[PDB]
Amino acid sequence: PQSVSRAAITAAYRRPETEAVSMLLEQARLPQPVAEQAHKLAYQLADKLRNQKNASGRAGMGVALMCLAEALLRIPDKATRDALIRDSGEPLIRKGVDMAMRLMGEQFVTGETIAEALANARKLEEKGFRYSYDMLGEAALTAADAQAYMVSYQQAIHAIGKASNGRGIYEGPGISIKLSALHPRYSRAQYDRVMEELYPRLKSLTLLARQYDIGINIDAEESDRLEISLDLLEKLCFEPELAGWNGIGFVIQAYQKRCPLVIDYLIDLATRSRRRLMIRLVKGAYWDSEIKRAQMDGLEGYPVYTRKVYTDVSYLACAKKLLAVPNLIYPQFATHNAHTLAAIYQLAGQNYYPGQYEFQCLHGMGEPLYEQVTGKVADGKLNRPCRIYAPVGTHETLLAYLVRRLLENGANTSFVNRIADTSLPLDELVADPVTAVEKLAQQEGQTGLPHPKIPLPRD
Numbered sequence: 001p002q003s004v005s006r007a008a009i010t011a012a013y014r015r016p017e018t019e020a021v022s023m024l025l026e027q028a029r030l031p032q033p034v035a036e037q038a039h040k041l042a043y044q045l046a047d048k049l050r051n052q053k054n055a056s057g058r059a060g061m062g063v064a065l066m067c068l069a070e071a072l073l074r075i076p077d078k079a080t081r082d083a084l085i086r087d088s089g090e091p092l093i094r095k096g097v098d099m100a101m102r103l104m105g106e107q108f109v110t111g112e113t114i115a116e117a118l119a120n121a122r123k124l125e126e127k128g129f130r131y132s133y134d135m136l137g138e139a140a141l142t143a144a145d146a147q148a149y150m151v152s153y154q155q156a157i158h159a160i161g162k163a164s165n166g167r168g169i170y171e172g173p174g175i176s177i178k179l180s181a182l183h184p185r186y187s188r189a190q191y192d193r194v195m196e197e198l199y200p201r202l203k204s205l206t207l208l209a210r211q212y213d214i215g216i217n218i219d220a221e222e223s224d225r226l227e228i229s230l231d232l233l234e235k236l237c238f239e240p241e242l243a244g245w246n247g248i249g250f251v252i253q254a255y256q257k258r259c260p261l262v263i264d265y266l267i268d269l270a271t272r273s274r275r276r277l278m279i280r281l282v283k284g285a286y287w288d289s290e291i292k293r294a295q296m297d298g299l300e301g302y303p304v305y306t307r308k309v310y311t312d313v314s315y316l317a318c319a320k321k322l323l324a325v326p327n328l329i330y331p332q333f334a335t336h337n338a339h340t341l342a343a344i345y346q347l348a349g350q351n352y353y354p355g356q357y358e359f360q361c362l363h364g365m366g367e368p369l370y371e372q373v374t375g376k377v378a379d380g381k382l383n384r385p386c387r388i389y390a391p392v393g394t395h396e397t398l399l400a401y402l403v404r405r406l407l408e409n410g411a412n413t414s415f416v417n418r419i420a421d422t423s424l425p426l427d428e429l430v431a432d433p434v435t436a437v438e439k440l441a442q443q444e445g446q447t448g449l450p451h452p453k454i455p456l457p458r459d
């Protein structure tokens, strides 16, 4: 027997999308006036982003001719110019792969060593950005692997905490950790061994973060690990040494059917354990693998949505739920999507205060968007804080994170991919996801039908 809130998470695991999407719709819908201010802000943010160095206005203004025009413009004297016009198998494939990973991946890495990352934190921190550092590495395969991740996480907390120098959990830097790094073969670990071995290391790192008064966030990974992550979180929140401290962070993934039910659980947990939880709301990073995984499991359905617009709707519904309980949750709204950002900005209401919520972004992806957001109003900014997720490590820790980035940047449904498309008009790019879903429902006959190219695992 689970609590009321836990049982309800379980019962939502793979509920039919028509049902899941239908229940989210009214929770996600922006009231008329909020919708229009969100549309307008989303449009302005996306316009500035696209047309940074006049990229579209130069579209408005063949190549052969320009080279001749170029050569003609290098003729120093206009008269002369005018007068001229009048009158090896396995290891070769492995090497190209390892190299291309480094080349493409550098943009997403803040530094090789935590010091190096930290020494460069001054530039954006003075502009009002914050940081969450991640010592790259995950999915420990051996007892030794996990031990080494544990020591890298401990070392980072010391350096981050010393650099935080008492600025605290909101204004100061934090750390992000992956539970998969701390226990060998996490992907298949049983409740009993995780509690005996993983939990004491999570507890120990969290106590340390509390000594330095820095935030410590537990990243969300694959969906089959949600339940055990909640058991770990629960225990952690009742530690006496952590009483009255609100630095514990936890990620929730809006692409999951369970997400809203996990929120109901977290609200009850913050209440029972007498704390404000730092909760990062994301869409999620593992969608391609989740789809593949469920298709091989052959179960009743998917634990994630199959159309990107449904995830967008789920995120807005979940964002409203989070924003309603400021005594219990500090929401951290992770996104690079201008509509998403604008919707959250408006949904948060009037009378922003720094401790109400922040935005978050990944290093190498969100800086352009958030250069319009974080900063003074007199500089034309929104004056909302943003916390940059800063991966730290060498080439041997980068692979899995990089692949997730390529999937995110390379998917035609991604905002960061669609905004680069000269040809997709701004209004479509920032279209309201609820209205989009209702448009599909009127075309197709029912609300929340799965992606037509993604049938159920049994079909």
Ligand SMILES: Cc1cc2nc3c(=O)[nH]c(=O)nc-3n(C[C@H](O)[C@H](O)[C@H](O)COP(=O)(O)OP(=O)(O)OC[C@H]3O[C@@H](n4cnc5c(N)ncnc54)[C@H](O)[C@@H]3O)c2cc1C
Pocket: 218, 219, 220, 221, 251, 253, 255, 280, 282, 283, 284, 285, 286, 287, 304, 305, 306, 307, 308, 309, 310, 311, 312, 334, 335, 336, 337, 340, 360, 361, 362, 387, 388, 389, 408, 411, 413, 414, 415, 416, 451
């Ligand atoms: C600071 C930060 C921290 C993050 N931490 C985590 C974390 O701990 N764990 C984690 O899993 N993710 C995490 N993410 C989220 C993930 O890494 C992506 O960055 C995020 O999902 C992209 O959302 P968006 O709003 O920027 O882009 P959008 O383009 O609006 O949405 C992109 C996405 O929608 C979802 N999607 C794509 N196609 C479909 C489809 N067909 N059906 C349903 N959904 C689809 C995927 O989640 C994909 O990322 C984090 C993101 C940030 C910025």
Ligand SMILES: O=C(O)[C@@H]1CCCO1
Pocket: 219, 220, 285, 389, 401, 404, 405
């Ligand atoms: O690892 C990832 O891909 C996501 C983004 C940062 C934390 O979890």
